[PDB]
Each structure stands twice: as C-alpha cells, then as structure tokens.
Amino acid sequence: AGGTIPXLMXGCGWLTGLCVR
C-alpha cells in the first residue's frame, strides 16, 4: 500500500516499467 517497491526501488513495472525515474 506504501507504493515503495513496485518500482520505487528502480526495478519493476509500476508506472514507469524500466525504472526511468
């Protein structure tokens, strides 16, 4: 629920996909 991990870390498919943040 935090949202930290699904792509916050820099390795997922959250909203970015290929960690572009």
The whole-angstrom separation of Cα 13 and Cα 15 is: 6
16 neighbors 7 (Cβ within 8 angstroms): yes
**Cα 13 from chain centre:** 6
Residue 4, phi-psi category: left (phi > 0), alpha (psi -120 to 50), beta (remainder): beta
Structure method: NMR
Q: How many other CB atoms are there within 10 angstroms of residue 7's CB atom? A: 18
